[PDB]
């Protein structure tokens, strides 16, 4: 029972014992695997009263009991080292709100776990056995504050934490000191997304991606996730989406697809908006609103027309939901964009239309702001036309070519450049059986 | 080495390669270590001479040493269709295999047998049988109680003379009246 | 710092040990590709005719000769199985004497042939 609970952890420690003698890939991925199966046993009734007794005994095990806080009494230096650390890993696991509610207790514990005899020698030894999420995933909760008077001061524990993560960013020595890292960024990112202005993300950019391989595509996507949101008000759209496009593409998430990928999708949906593309939410009908899309759809629904009021109405309606996702900042722009979009379409299809007939769409809307409004539109390209008011003729271009240009062959080049994608990758993985079969 | 490699690797003439391949195990002497892993590349070849050239340089570096690993590399090459090829492999291994025998190294029997096998075999060549009988008597040289040493960890120091006999004998089926040079590295236990 | 000096140092050897190989390869690459060539040119025109009888196995079989010779020979390593065709007029070296290739079906022997009007000239009516 607690036995079997312990027995599982015995296997974990037994697999920790694998890593203990130089064997992570087993251990970590097992620990990874263990992290999931961790939900099973969970709790910590006799698992720990039997753990703190099974392993060995250490001062910190005592200070850990301050987190335990209970009564058992009863009767009943090596193996009890990183196991204890690996259990401090599970300590954090005992903190999930699994076996906890207020980790603000555990906050200090975390430090008092993190900082002492830990966050010390571990550079290549601990391999992302740090979970700074599960470090912060704790603090994540409490950042429901509100309450804290943030934090302490303002809010320095987080500033500290940032600096502490910074204190890791040093510790990210790239000795392999990586994996967990840009969660730190991601934290800081979402910390920006909490308050700060990401743009130092550019510095965070400037450092790195979570290099590289063994990082969870999840994070690597979650990397992109915020990293998308960089370009959000960085107002790069593709790349933002490309992140999403590199995030949802192969980030592995079903359980976490649920609330969390919606988020992704939300901004993702928000992307094509940035481009005014309005894909068919005909899919985004599905696994969406419910709780995510449909305002986006309403947006799309509006953005299909981009009818400012009807547009605004959605916003008018969903602003809080927007506000809930802070996609509100968006769309304030695509308003006239779609207006200008329509302006472009089923309309520019003459080599003109007039001033006033194209002004008619503005005679539908406004006048001689047209001049601006058209220049407003022409300004961006995003249409191609000309005018002369001296002509009063809003002169709407071809947009007509052939592939005479290198334009296709650009794409061919684009295709060409990709010729190495799977081709060079085949060699990227050629190794593994081929090389391990030698073993 | 790297030069020597590609030089060997690239070159038209085999025995060049072969010898160049062979010559490797000298500049490569001090580490026999990866030499098998090295010649493992050339353990495989389209070309025997390659696979010929292999045997020596490897069989050289471990002559006074171990690595059944290195050895066992060559055992298929002891079966490499050309007796001349394996003829080396016979010798080459036996160069390693004096004093090492008998459940310390069991396979020696086979090896010795394989000689005898070959030596008995009428259809194994006097390429094969030759090297075998030699490789046999190699293991048996100086009443079999004597060893083969170069860059002698006893001293830690090279013996040019230890080298020479090989290099001498290197060309032989070229010029048969040679191998007697091989007596150099013969070393007392 | 130190035992690396022992330890660490030794691994540039591996660095090197790695390095060599591609070289060998590129050669070997070329090696095939140059060797690869004549492998084709093994084939050549001044061949003889026979009738494929039957494979003994892949790149083996009994066939016919226009001399009636039927012997264990070789065939296309070009073809395989589904590629290999169980009775065929065939292409044989004289001396290497092996199957160079099938002959897409022969027709006109005796018999005394067949009517062949390919696109007849007559419209009806």
């Amino acid at each position: 029972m607690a036995s079997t609970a312990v027995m599982m952890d015995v296997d974990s420690s037994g697999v920790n014992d694998l890593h203990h003698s130089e064997k992570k890939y087993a251990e970590e991925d097992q620990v990874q695997e263990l992290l999931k199966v961790l939900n099973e046993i969970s709790k910590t009734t006799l698992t720990l009263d039997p753990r703190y007794i099974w392993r060995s005994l250490k001062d910190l095990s005592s200070l850990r009991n301050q987190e335990l806080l209970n009564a058992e009494t009863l009767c009943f230096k090596t193996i009890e080292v990183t196991a204890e650390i690996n259990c401090f890993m599970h300590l954090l696991v005992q903190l999930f709100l699994w076996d906890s509610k207020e980790l603000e207790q555990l906050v200090e514990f975390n430090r008092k776990v993190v900082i002492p005899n830990l966050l010390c020698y571990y550079n290549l030894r601990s391999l992302n056995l740090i979970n700074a999420k599960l470090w912060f995933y704790i603090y994540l909760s409490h950042e429901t504050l509100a309450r804290s008077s943030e934090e302490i001061n303002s809010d320095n524990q987080n500033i500290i934490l940032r600096s502490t993560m910074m204190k890791f960013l040093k510790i990210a020595s790239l000795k392999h000191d990586n994996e967990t890292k840009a969660m730190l960024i991601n934290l800081i990112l979402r910390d920006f997304l909490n308050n700060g202005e990401v743009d130092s993300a550019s510095d965070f950019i400037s450092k790195l991606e979570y290099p590289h391989t063994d990082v969870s595509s999840s994070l690597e996507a979650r990397y992109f996730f915020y990293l998308s949101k960089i370009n959000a008000i960085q107002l790069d759209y593709s790349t933002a989406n490309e992140y999403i496009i590199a995030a949802i593409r192969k980030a592995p998430h079903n359980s976490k697809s649920l609330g969390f990928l919606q988020q992704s999708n939300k901004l993702h949906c928000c992307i094509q908006l940035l481009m005014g593309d309005i894909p068919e939410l005909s899919f985004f009908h599905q696994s969406n609103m419910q709780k995510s899309l449909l305002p986006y759809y309403h947006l799309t629904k509006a953005v299909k027309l981009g009818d400012l009021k009807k547009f605004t109405s959605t916003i008018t309606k969903y602003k809080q939901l927007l506000l809930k996702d802070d996609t509100y900042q968006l769309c304030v722009r695509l308003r006239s964009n779609v207006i200008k979009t329509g302006i472009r379409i089923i309309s520019l299809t003459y080599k003109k239309i007039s001033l006033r007939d194209i002004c008619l769409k503005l005679n539908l809307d406004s006048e001689q702001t047209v001049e601006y409004m058209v220049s407003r539109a022409i300004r961006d390209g995003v249409i191609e036309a000309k005018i002369n008011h001296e002509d009063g003729f809003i002169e709407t271009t071809e947009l007509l070519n052939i592939y005479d240009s290198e334009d296709p062959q650009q794409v061919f080049d684009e295709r060409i450049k990709f010729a190495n994608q799977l081709h060079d990758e085949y060699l990227v993985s050629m190794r593994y059986p081929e090389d391990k079969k030698t073993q | 080495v790297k030069r020597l490699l590609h030089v060997a690797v690239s070159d038209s003439n085999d025995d060049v390669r072969r010898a160049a391949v062979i010559a490797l195990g000298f500049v490569l002497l001090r580490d026999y270590t990866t030499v098998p892993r090295i010649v493992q590349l050339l353990s495989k070849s389209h070309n025997a001479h390659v696979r010929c050239g292999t045997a020596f340089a490897l069989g050289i570096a471990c002559a006074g040493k171990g690595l059944q690993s290195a050895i066992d590399v060559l055992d298929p090459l002891t079966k490499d269709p050309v007796d001349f090829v394996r003829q080396a492999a016979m010798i080459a291994l036996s160069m390693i295999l004096i004093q090492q025998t008998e459940k310390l190294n069991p396979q020696v029997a086979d090896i010795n047998k394989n000689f005898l096998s070959v030596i008995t075999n009428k259809h194994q060549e006097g390429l094969a049988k030759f090297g075998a009988c030699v490789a046999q008597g190699i293991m048996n040289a100086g009443g079999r109680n004597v060893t083969i040493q170069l860059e002698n960890a006893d001293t830690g120091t090279l013996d040019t003379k230890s080298v020479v006999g090989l290099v001498m004998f290197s060309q032989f089926w070229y010029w048969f009246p040679l191998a007697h040079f091989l007596s150099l590295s013969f070393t007392p236990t | 710092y130190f035992k690396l000096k022992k330890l660490e140092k030794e691994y540039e050897l591996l660095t090197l040990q790695e390095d060599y190989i591609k070289d060998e390869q590129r050669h070997l690459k070329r090696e095939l590709k140059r060797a690869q060539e004549e492998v084709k040119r093994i084939q050549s025109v001044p061949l003889v005719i026979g009738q494929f009888l039957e494979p003994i196995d892949q790149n083996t079989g009994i066939v016919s000769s226009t001399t009636g010779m039927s012997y264990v020979v070789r065939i296309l390593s070009t073809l395989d199985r589904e590629l290999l065709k169980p009775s065929m007029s065939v292409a044989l070296h004289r001396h290497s004497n092996a199957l160079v290739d099938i002959l897409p079906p022969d027709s006109d022997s005796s018999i005394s042939v067949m009517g062949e009007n390919e696109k007849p000239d007559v419209t009806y009516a």
């Binding site: 550079n123 081929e434 | 590349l41 | 690396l4 660490e8 691994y11 790695e18 190989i21 690459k29």
Partner: peptide
């Protein structure tokens, strides 16, 4: 120091495409 240390990891990581080309030499 640890300077000297993970310098290996490069070589350590290097070890490999190598062994592909190893398979490649084979594959050739």
């Amino acid at each position: 120091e640890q300077k000297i240390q993970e310098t290996e990891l490069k070589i350590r990581s290097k070890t490999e495409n190598v062994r592909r080309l190893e398979a490649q030499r084979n594959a050739l």
